Symmetry: D2
Amino acid sequence: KHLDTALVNAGRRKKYTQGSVNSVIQRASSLVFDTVEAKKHATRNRAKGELFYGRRGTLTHFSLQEAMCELEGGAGCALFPCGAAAVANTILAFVEQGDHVLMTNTAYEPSQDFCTKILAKLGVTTGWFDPLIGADIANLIQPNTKVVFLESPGSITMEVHDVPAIVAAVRRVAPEAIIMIDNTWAAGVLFKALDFGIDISIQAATKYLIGHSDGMIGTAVANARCWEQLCENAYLMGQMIDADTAYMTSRGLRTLGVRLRQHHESSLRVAEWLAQHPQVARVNHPALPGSKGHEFWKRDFSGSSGLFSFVLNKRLTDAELAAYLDNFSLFSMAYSWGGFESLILANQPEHIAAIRPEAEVDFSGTLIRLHIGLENVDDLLADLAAGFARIV
Amino acid sequence: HLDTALVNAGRRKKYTQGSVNSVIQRASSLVFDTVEAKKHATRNRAKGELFYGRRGTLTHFSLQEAMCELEGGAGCALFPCGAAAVANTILAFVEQGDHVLMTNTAYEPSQDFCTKILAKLGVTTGWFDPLIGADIANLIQPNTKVVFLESPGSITMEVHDVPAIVAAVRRVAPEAIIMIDNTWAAGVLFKALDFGIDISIQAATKYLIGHSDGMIGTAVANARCWEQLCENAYLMGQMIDADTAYMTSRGLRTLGVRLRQHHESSLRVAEWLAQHPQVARVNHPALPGSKGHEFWKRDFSGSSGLFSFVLNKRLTDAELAAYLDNFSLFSMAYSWGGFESLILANQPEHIAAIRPEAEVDFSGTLIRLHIGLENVDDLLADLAAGFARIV
Amino acid sequence: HLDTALVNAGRRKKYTQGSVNSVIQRASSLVFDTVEAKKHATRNRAKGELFYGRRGTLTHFSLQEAMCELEGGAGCALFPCGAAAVANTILAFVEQGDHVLMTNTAYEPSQDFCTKILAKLGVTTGWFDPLIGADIANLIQPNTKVVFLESPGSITMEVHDVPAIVAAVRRVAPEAIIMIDNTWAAGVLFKALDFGIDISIQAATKYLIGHSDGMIGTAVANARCWEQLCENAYLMGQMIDADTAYMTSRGLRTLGVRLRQHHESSLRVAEWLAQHPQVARVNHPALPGSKGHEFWKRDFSGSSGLFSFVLNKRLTDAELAAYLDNFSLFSMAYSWGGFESLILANQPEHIAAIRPEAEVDFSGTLIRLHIGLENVDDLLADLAAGFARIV
Amino acid sequence: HLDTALVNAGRRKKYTQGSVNSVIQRASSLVFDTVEAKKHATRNRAKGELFYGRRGTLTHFSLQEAMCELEGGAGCALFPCGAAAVANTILAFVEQGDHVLMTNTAYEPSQDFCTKILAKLGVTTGWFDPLIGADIANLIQPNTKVVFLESPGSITMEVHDVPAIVAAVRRVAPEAIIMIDNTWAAGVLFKALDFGIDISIQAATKYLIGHSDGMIGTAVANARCWEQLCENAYLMGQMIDADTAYMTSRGLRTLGVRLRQHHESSLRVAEWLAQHPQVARVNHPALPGSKGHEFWKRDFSGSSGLFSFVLNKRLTDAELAAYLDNFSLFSMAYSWGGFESLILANQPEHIAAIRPEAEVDFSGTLIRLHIGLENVDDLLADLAAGFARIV
Ligand SMILES: *Cc1c(COP(=O)(O)O)cnc(C)c1O
Ligand SMILES: *Cc1c(COP(=O)(O)O)cnc(C)c1O
Ligand SMILES: *Cc1c(COP(=O)(O)O)cnc(C)c1O
Ligand SMILES: *Cc1c(COP(=O)(O)O)cnc(C)c1O
Ligand SMILES: [Mg+2]
Ligand SMILES: [Mg+2]
Ligand SMILES: [Mg+2]
Ligand SMILES: [Mg+2]
């Protein structure tokens, strides 16, 4: 009986708000020390919420960091220019040459590319696992495995991990490993990752936290064991976010509850319609019974967001792809998601297989990924129905 | 002239659309009307076509065009701050087994990135005296990949002989990546890429923003190194928000009038300090006798407002408090490049600890000043009152 | 299809230019490429062509198009806040010797504009009971130029019978300008222009912005009244900054989902208060039995989250402090329409003083609540704890 | 010490909270922790205690303090733009039956406010020649309540003899409200309140913002007039958004270095125009021979960069296009006070139409220039090429 109240109030303390409802926006590089003693005090608390230097943050950042720590149950929150920077720099913060990373083969493609194109040449190897491996992940853990990287639901194809089984297996074989999750789909709040034994919860706050498709920012909330190393190594890479975007992220939290409930209701309705449609082969929605890992979503999540995908009954030709995608009236073609607008994107099976390392896909039709926004669901259904008629 | 270029750089109709300044386009998602439009945007995702917010919007493109014009580069990568620009530009060009050769006067966070991040990834770092000049050739190893310059040096303000260093590097390792932290010159008082440096890095936070209220890093690369810088910085998710990019473009418009005042005022202060009976030496690139001044005179078109001086005595903590706590106009803070004057102190052992494989040549307390836009006679009176407190 | 319209209103390519939201164009000067371009912009300076910052930029045009679509008007004037919109919209249609007829439940600053500004300029003001309905015809004078409505009324929440009032006004004074402060409905829960009202005024500060961090007023006029409103507001220099206009457009996108929560939660709180032994009366338009509820049910498509209730006793200043000072979730502040729940107390004599020529019909302290987006159980517990402190 | 005052004005710890610049506090609702705190805020709602966003936040308070310090006033009211500041400051001091006496060189929208808004409200307007000096006494009527000055005049740049005007007004109507549009001087090059003027009004849009990307009006009043200005502007809902207030404070920090460049460059251009064979007259307050130059020299501490000149001939329509359409650096746009140079043309009869009860004394085409921060030799070359197109 608290999440909605926590979202409205998280990070909103008088020291940050100074009498307004929202935190003040403190734009600053230089932060002034009135005395040498004040400078000494600030230096000793430069990572503990005392004004020291803009790269460590201002009151606006401290307010957002407190909100993220409260909502995701962590000991600290690092901020980044975008989600991709959060993933790359959080992984980097915990590896050194000779280490091994174990990542789900459904990870967001830029996350994979960071591992294969940056980490590889820096002496860090990456292995892969099927998202439904569950307890069998233990057999893949090597003596030098330092990081296990989860993403539930997976990117595009939406497979849900059995996180309890994975975490228990990792803690049995490699108790000191750093378990991370890209928790963007859950907005960090529909899946309480740190309560499951995960060490760090990473978000592209760009998506649901910002909620309006007009700001970019990454967050990483770490437990007490991992916070200091994440904080100091992210700082050595100069990672931070501007004060105004931090303000807009805090601001987005306030409507996250009401927004996510609509995204859940509308997207599940669309998925249930698609699941009965003669032109659809498969619907990948975590909240839909029968979807991959749905039993884990039902057990471990408190709700759903609005992003999912479905497979058409056929592989669209280039001409059919253009006829389908070019003539939507409400859905817009774009990258990213999590805003008020509904989006659509297409992928051929071989496009997905190319970003499923050491694995193949199990479908042959064209995959359509939908983000269901805040439009009237009957209008969205009519848009999709017209699209079906263009490719029949 | 530079003042005209600063006023107009990056201001094209496609960005400004009737206003004086570029529009502010806040976006993650960028919409493709057709599959063909998406294909075109993908092909030009790094060439100023709208593709995805992490690659930029019209606002970023305008700033990038301004920076390329002003610094004479093929591309400009953007970062959340100067420290991110340095760390990720170096990282973009190294791999396990490589070697980085860096001036021992590099900004401390730049050194810390090398010794704490690169070292654990199998990338080693070596050091050189800022005045080493042509003799840097003897320090280039078979695996040296990056040569990192910073002229003037951090805090102590030594000016490199860049033509001598570059010629020496190109004689031994013509393919090496030469980088410079060009923040003190705001990228315009020293045309790094015209000297054969490959990448000019800036904490745009300082003079480009110019008001101490935004943080952003830039890296302008020549044609040979741009694609690797662009794509590897992108793989690390590096970008800046649209509003800060707008404020950086906006800062350019007054950069000329601001720098001229910083130069005039700071040189007056340095000249007075150079004759002062409590001052051992003044480190100001524009002051005759300062280390590398002849190279500043030859290679720079002007000066900014940041410099340092060494006191005759080592202040005690009690004297440091009496001195610094009671200034009326100078403020204690990190960073610089704004309209306000700032002051910071370092003891010699503090500087020695960030001069790897080298010794300091002074024993008194080192004071770093940023000279802002206040009336210079008011600033001189503030400094004179300070001297009276540490007699 | 209100949710769809809210998501798309004002979003045309010329404004969004590839992003989901409009670009932010900050500008005073707007540049003309040729003499012919200057002529064209001058003729269309009030018709959505870039002429001068005071007339607006692309960002303002986007919001104005959205507001005209959502409220079904011919034009939308923008103002620095709701009070500026009310004051200047009334002023735009009066001259010396005119008469204004205003509901006695009007927002107090709206009353004060009439009694302190209009009065000294030769414009008189008369008052009517919010439930007068068709009997307003007897109050219309030959010089009555404006009839000003506010439904539900400020604080006490009485709902007008707008159809009866409009029909009566048109019978007697067909040319009179009928205005309404439609802030409680966010302009969308009550379609004022469809009822024959001429101008719908909003403190967009409230639900359109929706986060308590921006101030802006809007006034949407029908075709008959738009040109006069537009030009007379412009002569008073009324405008809003581009960034606030952007944030207002942005607020529209979540307005439907927000209002539905405000409706559900506030009605649940009202139903609990209506059975509470320490409550004398609940003033919620959506609650059966409230003053004008039958008119809300018939004429509105929903409810927002602002309402009030009367305590069984008039709290003393000591009891008022014990009550208000110790709420954990409700905050004491002016304004409303945000994500946070707010509480504000008015003693009955305070209300009577801002009910011109009328008395109040209650004797307990009046508590006005804005129900935000918090968990209702927590809000009820906060209210329950308050009751325990004054029982 | 103006540069030092500009850097530090309004920058107190209560507003800056550790940063160099004031915090940006966006707010409508301002929370009261207790009933006692609310009573204190209510009592001091116009005295810098947080009460309600329409009265201001910390950001507004900081700007107001800076403006009061820089212009030597008791209070500073904020408006959405300069036109709103003029219209509402006049309206704040008149009532039906009053008379306004305004210079016939007043900014045209200021005149249109008087003839189109004030007139229908029973307030009349008279006019005087800007060089009338002591002879203004003969135009003061028993009901003259406001005397409105603008020095230099709009477009034609005539400088008032303010001491002679004020002395005459105080002899005849000591209680009259003397106002001045002090935008050209940016409120700092002419200390209006020190001359006995009651209210100094500014389009802060111009030089205070300094970058053509924000609109805001200010009015600084002496102690005698502050309360009436403050409360009556508030009844009209006049305010500015927090972010623009921040950007205005920020513009102050470079105002000194900018104005000195605008002065130096614009006077160089004026001196060149004054000796040019294609120029009939140059209207620049700092140029000897210009109308009222002796008053500028005596009463101002410097110049900005806006002025005008008259061509030797009346350009035809074709010549106007050839002249204005082909400039490379000067842009055609309204407003001024930014970093870019601007050019606009007016035929004599256009000016005569906005010179009430007066004619113009020139027959050539009038060119108004704003001289920005570009290199002045580049600007001179642009103007020279323009002369060659019409010779
Ligand atoms: C979008 C996405 C990212 C990248 O976020 P950006 O802010 O766009 O860099 C990371 N993880 C997931 C799951 C994403 O969908
Ligand atoms: C300040 C500084 C940096 C770091 O810039 P930030 O924007 O504060 O991260 C980099 N290089 C130099 C020379 C600096 O002085
Ligand atoms: C708040 C309020 C206003 C004034 O709005 P502001 O934006 O604060 O000026 C006007 N009308 C009503 C009904 C209000 O509640
Ligand atoms: C531009 C101008 C104004 C009006 O200022 P805005 O902010 O554009 O409304 C007022 N006075 C003078 C002298 C001006 O030039
Ligand atoms: Mg594969
Ligand atoms: Mg050493
Ligand atoms: Mg009464
Ligand atoms: Mg005339």
